Amino acid sequence: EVRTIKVFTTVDNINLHTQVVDMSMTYGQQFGPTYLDGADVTKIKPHNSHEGKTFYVLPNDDTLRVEAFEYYHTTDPSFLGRYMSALNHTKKWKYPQVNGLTSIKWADNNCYLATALLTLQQIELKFNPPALQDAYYRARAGEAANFCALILAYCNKTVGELGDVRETMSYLFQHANLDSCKRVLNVVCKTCGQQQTTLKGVEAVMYMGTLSYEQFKKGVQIPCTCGKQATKYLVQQESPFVMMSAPPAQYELKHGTFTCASEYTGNYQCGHYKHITSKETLYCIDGALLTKSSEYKGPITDVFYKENSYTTTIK
Ligand SMILES: NC(=S)N/N=C/c1ccc(O)cc1O
Ligand SMILES: [Cl-]
Ligand SMILES: [Cl-]
Ligand SMILES: [Cl-]
Ligand SMILES: [Cl-]
Ligand SMILES: [Cl-]
Ligand SMILES: [Zn+2]
Numbered sequence: 567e568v569r570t571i572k573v574f575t576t577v578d579n580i581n582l583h584t585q586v587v588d589m590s591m592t593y594g595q596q597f598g599p600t601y602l603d604g605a606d607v608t609k610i611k612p613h614n615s616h617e618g619k620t621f622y623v624l625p626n627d628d629t630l631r632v633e634a635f636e637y638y639h640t641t642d643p644s645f646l647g648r649y650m651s652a653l654n655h656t657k658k659w660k661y662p663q664v665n666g667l668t669s670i671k672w673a674d675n676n677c678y679l680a681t682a683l684l685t686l687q688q689i690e691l692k693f694n695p696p697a698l699q700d701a702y703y704r705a706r707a708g709e710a711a712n713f714c715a716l717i718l719a720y721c722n723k724t725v726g727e728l729g730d731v732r733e734t735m736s737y738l739f740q741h742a743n744l745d746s747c748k749r750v751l752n753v754v755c756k757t758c759g760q761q762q763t764t765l766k767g768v769e770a771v772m773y774m775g776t777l778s779y780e781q782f783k784k785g786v787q788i789p790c791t792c793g794k795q796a797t798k799y800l801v802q803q804e805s806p807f808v809m810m811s812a813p814p815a816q817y818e819l820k821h822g823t824f825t826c827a828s829e830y831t832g833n834y835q836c837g838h839y840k841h842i843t844s845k846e847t848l849y850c851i852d853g854a855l856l857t858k859s860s861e862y863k864g865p866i867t868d869v870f871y872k873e874n875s876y877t878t879t880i881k
Pocket of ligand 2: 655658
């Protein structure tokens with residue numbers, strides 16, 4: 567006897583596609599690679615309990631290609647399988663609310679993802695891909711499994727791999743609307759004179775080399791092409807935040823002078839991030855763990871500051 571069930575296939579979990587499947591054949595033989603809420607069911611034959619359920623598939627016809635691109639804003643052929651593989655793990659993580667924010671209980675080297683997620687909830691940022699819009703909304707509400715899996719897929723990191731917070735933020739910023747953001751810098755060399763530069767989008771909100779927004783406004787020393795040392799300072803800034811980053815170093819964080827920051831303890835090959843947020847006092851969120859202090863010193867690698875419009879007085 568021939569036995570079938572009805573299931574739906576999807577690439578975006580919104581647009582469904584009716585299918586009839588043969589219970590004597592695997593999903594793989596019928597759809598190609600197939601997933602059920604992250605689980606790889608490619609080598610599995612249909613079960614009775616599968617009737618009416620939704621399965622993710624790869625974009626193997628033009629309708630799915632268009633639906634996948636519109637939702638994710640990527641055409642990397644291994645994206646969906648990387649997203650499903652991550653999701654099968656992130657759906658098992660825990661997402662406690664810590665001081666009003668969605669955090670992540672430590673697992674699988676995910677400390678960099680927790681600090682990133684905590685940071686996002688403290689800065690003004692809108693994502694462009696619908697997939698990230700929808701999953702970030704759920705994450706803010708507490709159900710961050712899809713959002714975390716998407717970050718991993720977009721950053722090309724697997725669960726368990728050690729991640730860098732600045733790189734992760736660069737990827738997310740690439741998929742956000744920062745088109746309004748503008749930065750003007752000036753560089754002064756005693757032998758070469760001056761040169762001004764204007765930066766836009768992601769490059770207007772990120773800086774690598776110093777943690778201090780004030781020192782960026784006063785000036786910082788960088789090499790020049792003659793061998794001289796030149797000074798770079800911030801001429802104009804238009805953005806709702808800025809991110810200052812540097813190799814980890816002992817640094818003092820003062821209440822009320824920054825929004826939030828990342829601390830990294832360890833070495834190049836492995837280590838651990840924690841998150842510091844400046845509220846009524848200084849809170850350190852380490853996954854599910856929370857402590858407080860009136861002052862803070864530690865190896866800081868990123869600091870986030872509020873902004874709207876700044877213009878220098880330097881002449
Ligand atoms: N190539 C064309 S026209 N669209 N494909 C979209 C697409 C493909 C693979 C994938 O994993 C995610 C996607 O958004
Ligand atoms: Cl896991
Ligand atoms: Cl927990
Ligand atoms: Cl959004
Ligand atoms: Cl204070
Ligand atoms: Cl600030
Ligand atoms: Zn020079």
